[PDB]
Amino acid sequence: SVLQVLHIPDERLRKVAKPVEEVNAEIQRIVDDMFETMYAEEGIGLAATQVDIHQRIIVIDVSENRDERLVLINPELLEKSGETGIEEGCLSIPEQRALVPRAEKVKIRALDRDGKPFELEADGLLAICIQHEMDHLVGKLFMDYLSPLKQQRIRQKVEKLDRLKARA
Ligand code: NI
């Protein structure tokens, strides 16, 4: 099922997600919708909190042919180093993009769709991607990294857009 993705200035986006207590079949259909929703909206990442499910779940898929889906449940950052930035987007901040400072290499521990722990070292798009998504889980958006004035502008452009969304 495709779930609905919240946009700013929706203040649920600022909620801190809770740890997943047990990776069961409820949890695995959240994951399956989250992918379906992600692919439908054409994103490369989605955090639970964006679909109003405030638990620590993230889906990411970089692959052209959707054959390397990545699930991060209860992710913890073990190490980071370096710094980078690309012009990031976000399904919750529709059509806006900005350069956000990120660590370049990141090492995480997380659980997969089957509640099995794993460790992932990442750089490149993956590492920026993982950081962006993890930020969602604690109520952080990428515009939080920009100037007051840059933020202001972003908020307007989006409202304008969603004004058209519910178009009628
Ligand atoms: Ni985002």
Side-chain angles (χ1 to χ4, degrees):
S1 313
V2 185
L3 310 161
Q4 190 203 54
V5 177
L6 316 179
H7 306 168
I8 58 156
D10 194 306
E11 67 171 69
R12 288 170 281 179
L13 258 4
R14 326 280 345 185
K15 280 159 113 296
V16 174
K18 300 198 184 264
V20 163
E21 159 186 291
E22 163 181 30
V23 181
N24 54 38
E26 167 182 16
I27 289 303
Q28 291 171 320
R29 17 240 223 235
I30 283 161
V31 167
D32 288 346
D33 300 325
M34 281 185 57
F35 271 123
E36 220 170 313
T37 306
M38 191 202 68
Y39 293 129
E41 304 301 300
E42 297 192 314
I44 54 184
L46 199 71
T49 119
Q50 279 177 278
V51 295
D52 213 6
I53 296 141
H54 300 280
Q55 301 177 63
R56 295 174 70 71
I57 298 154
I58 297 166
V59 302
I60 285 162
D61 189 45
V62 174
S63 71
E64 170 126 56
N65 286 128
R66 297 357 217 143
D67 43 321
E68 262 302 283
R69 285 142 80 114
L70 174 72
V71 177
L72 268 65
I73 278 164
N74 295 320
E76 116 191 84
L77 181 73
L78 299 182
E79 288 159 37
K80 66 179 169 73
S81 72
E83 64 287 313
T84 12
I86 57 196
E87 302 190 331
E88 281 178 38
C90 192
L91 294 179
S92 296
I93 301 168
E95 282 168 59
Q96 304 316 291
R97 295 183 162 249
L99 225 204
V100 159
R102 296 294 182 195
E104 177 189 65
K105 287 199 52 58
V106 116
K107 185 223 265 183
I108 59 141
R109 208 148 51 208
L111 304 176
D112 56 25
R113 191 155 180 296
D114 309 317
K116 282 296 112 213
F118 67 97
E119 277 187 20
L120 179 62
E121 301 181 70
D123 51 42
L125 229 212
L126 231 215
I128 291 168
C129 222
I130 285 174
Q131 292 170 74
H132 175 120
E133 290 319 325
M134 279 183 82
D135 271 2
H136 276 301
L137 300 187
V138 296
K140 267 286 283 292
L141 307 166
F142 78 64
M143 47 183 261
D144 294 351
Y145 292 114
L146 310 182
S147 62
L149 237 168
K150 207 70 73 261
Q151 302 191 28
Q152 225 82 173
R153 304 203 41 121
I154 286 178
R155 166 102 177 268
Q156 339 230 221
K157 309 187 82 190
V158 167
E159 282 183 8
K160 207 279 252 317
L161 225 38
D162 293 344
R163 213 148 299 203
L164 302 357
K165 192 133 287 175
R167 152 279 132 108

